[PDB]
Design a protein around this ligand. Structure first.
Ligand SMILES: NC(=O)c1ccc[n+]([C@@H]2O[C@H](COP(=O)([O-])OP(=O)(O)OC[C@H]3O[C@@H](n4cnc5c(N)ncnc54)[C@H](O)[C@@H]3O)[C@@H](O)[C@H]2O)c1
Lengths: 207, 823
């Protein structure tokens, strides 16, 4: 268990249940104490958050080229925030707010983390990424961080094998049930969560 | 007794022998008790779709000599009695009137010791204002003997005062045009007994008994059995002087021939004088069977008295011989019950109880049934004959012979008898009878008039409203009982047309009512019946409306999550007239867009171009809020229409100010940019875009809130009228009018009362008037607060902050920038 102490944690439109900032601080510390490190945020819908936090991150089919498949996260919570919502309306057209998740990896996986200035998920970057990770795509026990688009913010792609070794816990940053589609307001980010959200330094050169 | 449908119809065509009546009594006076005795004695039974008991049918059979005493046209010795169910407390004023309006007579139950209580007095006023004839029964005499142990004369004087109080009310408030309607024991219009033990009597019953032992006609015997008549025991001589020659006191006839026998049974039995009881019993010819011969104390007294003077008989006698038939009563009630010309073809038909004329059927209420969630109409035929399959004009509240508003020309699926808890289909039903109808609940909310003449006006309307102006959050204390509550609400919502059960976005279970009390009883029914589970209920909350006062300061723009779609719109106020027309079905979502546009254009000053481009109403697809498509050459615009409408439904359900519904908000879509590929503008993309643009546009359009306001109608005696104004002047009340009933000293004060000022209103009005005021309030209109909702200190802002906190929102209302495109 990596969720710390307290009641049963669940995800709701009203916010993550039994998940205070203080509990997060405890869970985070205990994670590092066991050799884990924070690598970014993942925004998604409620049921997905339930699956990821309690069943673990598991590989699945996604709509892109096979060579870029993996678990997508972002160091900047504001980016991941845009995905923290229903992607499809229910029968009546309801679109619920989702939840922000914090993604941790074993520190032993850090030698596999690389960065690039190129724009990811594009054929003009595949060659350079395959150079950094020392093998042809897709990513496996390695990760790549770079601009999600030209001039855009950074995203991190965890190879599926690496993603399944993550530990994911809820963020203390809430989504807004009354502003689904709105952007994350930095002032709604708990100062104490910001203090534990530094990212590791990724390698710019292959091993 | 068990009857066939043929028999019921047979004694239903004989309207001269029908008694439409209700029981006026305080609940603590054994109202239910006396009603039971009536059912167990004369209750009618039929030779699978059940209904909530609304009316009971009773059958009484009398002798040819008895039928001659009736001072109104009669035919045969059979009598059909309709006991119309009455509310348990005055507070349910609107339905207290509903019952009285379909009744012609009333059995008024008063107390022996306490006499006439305040509420029984108030209700009687109303019944009298309805031109209803009273017959009195002095109940709970038992207490006067067992507890107080009063003397015969003391008890007599007690009745005298009681009857005196009743007639003070009757002669004051009964309408002059009915003649002397006061009650007189000597005339058999007053009974005495104890519902508890099930015994009761009238002077006529004892008069019939002694009629022979005195060689005298019943008439002059009961004349003597009350008042100052004395039969000297020593001289065997009748007298009107309470002293003999030597100056000794003489006992009055009432005490001697009526009270004395009863007093002796009470004394002999309760004193366990086993040797007197037998002698006393044979004297009066009260024969006990097997088991009964062993009883003693109250057990014995109860059996003896029940067999001696069956309560139901004393009551039925009065009901048949003195209560008016439909024929007799409608002759002077018609003018009062018709909202049109007095000499109209229909009003005339109502006075004559004409079964041949055009139909005039009155629906007093809708009754919950077991046939799905449907409601059965309940009421009375005042003219013509109602038939199964018969097509009728369903004339609602707003109906007027002129316009075709609130009019539904449908067919009666089935006509049925309301045999208490059960239903009995019949071919037809002539004027004068109470009846139920099938297949009307979707055309009539609660009340209305059924007609077959397209020149007939409604009958005296009873104002109601389905507007849920008050609501609460329901929540199980044990999280496993959740399903029981979910089905409980689904159940609650079905037992009442004016109760609302829905889920807010946040997922809360909401119960909404038409008033403080109405919502109160619903939550009690839910926690003991529909659900039966321990519930956590939040304090009552008033339902407000969010609206705009001007057009958006600037164009509202919002972008989709994927940044590939954009909606440009602007919000503007809708005229109250138009909002009213929408709420009243004139402007209709289900209507043809071209016929509907003509109306908005011609009658309401809308550009027919705009009215033709209505995409939807909201909330709930029919609210007084509109989306208008004013875009020019937007490719694939129609492919996002379903998404935009959806967004509108959610946006108008819970507005950006504090989660309250929108009202009178027009949204104009000025422009839309879409991704060429449909894959990138599905529901998930457009819905949040449209919704946020709407909030943005709303916030830019001078946001305000509206509060619900009641129209209250108070009946009150002149003296206590001052208490009415006293209460209204600290609840922002506003007097509409103050009319006085011609002869009587009864006033009718009408005033507007903010719903958020009505909590505990009847309680305060009760005190300020000594309980003599009779309140009736219905939702009337919405009122836009002047103050700024965005200002936490202003009145509107004070409401907003409190509510936003309560919901756990950010205290301050979001700016339009939050929902505007972030850039
Ligand atoms: N989601 C983010 O926070 C994020 C961060 C950076 C970039 N992106 C961009 O968004 C695009 C979509 O990525 P995505 O991840 O939102 O959708 P995806 O198609 O890559 O994954 C599909 C969904 O499955 C869900 N899921 C449910 N249970 C899961 C489990 N047990 N294990 C793993 N996933 C589970 C995930 O939440 C995800 O939303 C990417 O192409 C990327 O460019 C997203």
């Amino acid at each position: 268990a990596f969720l710390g102490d307290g009641g049963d944690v669940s995800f709701s439109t009203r916010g993550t249940q039994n998940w205070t900032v203080e509990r997060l601080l405890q869970a985070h510390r205990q994670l590092e104490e066991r050799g884990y490190v924070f690598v970014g945020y993942h925004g998604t819908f409620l049921e997905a958050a339930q699956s990821i936090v309690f069943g673990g991150v598991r590989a699945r089919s996604q709509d892109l080229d096979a060579i870029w498949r993996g678990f997508y996260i972002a160091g900047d919570p504001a980016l991941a925030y845009g995905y923290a919502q229903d992607q499809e309306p229910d029968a009546r057209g309801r679109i619920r707010n989702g939840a922000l998740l914090r993604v941790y990896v074993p520190r032993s996986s850090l030698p596999g983390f690389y960065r690039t200035s190129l724009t990811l998920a594009a054929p003009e970057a595949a060659g350079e990424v395959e150079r950094l990770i020392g093998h042809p795509l897709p990513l496996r026990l390695d990760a790549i961080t770079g601009p999600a688009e030209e001039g855009g913010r950074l995203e991190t792609i965890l190879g599926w094998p690496l993603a399944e070794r993550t530990v994911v816990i809820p963020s203390a940053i809430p989504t807004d049930p009354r502003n689904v589609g709105g952007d994350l307001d930095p002032s709604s980010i708990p100062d104490k969560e910001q203090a534990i959200s530094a990212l590791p330094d990724y390698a710019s050169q292959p091993g | 007794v068990a009857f066939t449908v043929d028999q019921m119809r047979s004694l239903m065509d004989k309207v001269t022998n029908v008694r439409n009546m209700s029981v006026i009594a305080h609940v603590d006076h054994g109202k239910s008790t006396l009603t039971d005795s009536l059912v167990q004695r004369a209750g009618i039974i039929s030779a699978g779709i059940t209904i909530k008991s609304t009316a009971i049918s009773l059958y009484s059979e009398m002798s040819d000599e008895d039928v001659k005493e009736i001072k109104q046209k009669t035919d045969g010795n059979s009598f059909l009695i309709n006991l119309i169910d009455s509310p348990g407390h005055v507070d349910f004023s609107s339905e207290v009137t509903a019952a009285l309006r379909v009744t012609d007579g009333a059995l008024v139950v008063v107390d022996t010791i306490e006499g006439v209580c305040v509420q029984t007095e108030t209700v009687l006023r109303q019944a009298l204002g309805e031109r209803i004839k009273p017959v009195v029964v002095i109940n709970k005499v038992d207490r006067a003997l067992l507890e107080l142990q009063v003397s015969k004369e003391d008890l007599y004087q007690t009745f005298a005062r009681t009857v005196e109080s009743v007639n003070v009310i009757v002669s004051t408030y009964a309408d002059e045009v009915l003649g002397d309607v006061q009650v007189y024991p000597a005339r058999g219009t007053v009974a005495f007994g104890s519902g508890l033990h099930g015994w009761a009597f009238t002077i006529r019953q004892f008069a019939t008994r002694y009629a022979k032992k005195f060689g005298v006609d019943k008439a002059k015997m009961m004349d003597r059995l009350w008042g100052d008549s004395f039969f000297n025991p020593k001289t065997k001589k009748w007298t009107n002087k309470d002293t003999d020659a030597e100056g000794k006191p003489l006992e009055r006839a009432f005490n001697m021939f009526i009270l004395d026998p009863i007093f002796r049974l009470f004394t002999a039995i309760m004193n366990f004088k086993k040797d007197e009881i037998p002698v006393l019993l044979e004297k009066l010819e009260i024969v006990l069977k097997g088991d009964e011969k062993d009883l003693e104390g109250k057990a014995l007294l109860k059996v003896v008295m029940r067999k001696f003077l069956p309560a139901a008989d004393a009551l039925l006698e009065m009901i048949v011989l003195h209560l008016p038939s439909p024929v007799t009563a409608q002759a002077y009630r018609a003018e009062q019950l018709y909202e049109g010309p007095a000499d109209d073809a229909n009003c005339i038909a109502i006075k004559n109880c004409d079964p041949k004329a055009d139909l005039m059927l009155y629906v007093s209420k809708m009754v919950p049934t077991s046939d799905k969630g449907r409601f059965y109409a309940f009421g009375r035929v005042f003219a013509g004959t109602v038939k199964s399959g018969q097509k009728v004009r369903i004339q609602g509240p707003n109906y007027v012979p002129g316009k075709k508003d609130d009019l539904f020309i449908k067919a009666i699926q089935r006509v049925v008898l309301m045999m208490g808890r059960f239903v009995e289909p019949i071919d037809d039903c002539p004027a004068g009878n109470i009846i139920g109808l099938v297949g009307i609940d979707q055309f009539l909310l609660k009340t209305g008039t059924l007609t077959t003449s397209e020149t007939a006006h409604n009958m005296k309307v009873m104002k109601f409203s389905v507007s849920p102006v008050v609501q609460v959050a329901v929540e199980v204390k044990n999280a496993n009982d959740l399903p029981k509550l979910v089905e409980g609400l689904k159940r609650l919502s079905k037992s009442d047309p004016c109760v609302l059960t829905y889920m807010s976005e946040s997922g809360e279970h909401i119960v909404a009512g038409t008033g403080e009390l109405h919502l109160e009883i619903c939550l009690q029914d839910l926690e003991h019946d529909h659900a039966g589970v321990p519930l956590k209920i939040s304090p009552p909350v008033v339902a407000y409306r969010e609206t705009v006062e001007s057009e958006s300061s600037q164009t509202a723009l919002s972008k989709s999550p994927n940044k590939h779609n954009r909606i440009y719109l602007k919000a503007e106020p809708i005229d109250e007239e138009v909002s009213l027309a929408i709420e009243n079905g004139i402007i209709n979502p289900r209507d043809d867009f071209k016929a509907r546009a003509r109306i908005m254009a011609d009658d309401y000053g809308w550009d027919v171009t705009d009215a033709r481009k209505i995409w939807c109403f909201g909330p709930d697809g029919n609210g007084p809020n509109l989306v208008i498509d004013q875009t020019k050459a937007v490719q694939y615009l129609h492919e996002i229409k379903d998404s935009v409408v959806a967004a509108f439904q959610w946006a108008t359900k819970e507005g950006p100010i504090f989660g309250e519904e929108m009202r009178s908000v027009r949204v104009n879509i000025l422009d839309v940019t879409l991704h060429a590929d449909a894959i990138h503008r599905g529901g998930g993309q457009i819905i949040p875009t449209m919704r946020r643009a709407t909030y943005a546009g709303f916030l830019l359009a001078d946001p305000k809130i509206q509060e619900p306001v009641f129209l209250v109608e108070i009946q009150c005696p002149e003296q206590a009228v001052g208490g009415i104004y006293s209460v209204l002047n600290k609840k922002r009340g506003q007097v509409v009018s103050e009319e006085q009933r011609p002869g009587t000293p009864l006033f009718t004060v009408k005033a507007y009362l903010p719903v958020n000022e009505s909590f505990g209103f009847t309680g305060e009005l009760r005190q300020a008037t000594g309980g003599q005021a009779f309140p009736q309030m219905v939702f009337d209109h919405w009122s836009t607060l002047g103050s700024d909702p965005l200002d936490p200190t202003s009145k509107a802002g004070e409401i907003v902050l409190a509510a936003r906190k309560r919901h756990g929102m950010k205290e301050e209302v979001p700016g339009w920038q939050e929902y505007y495109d972030k850039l």
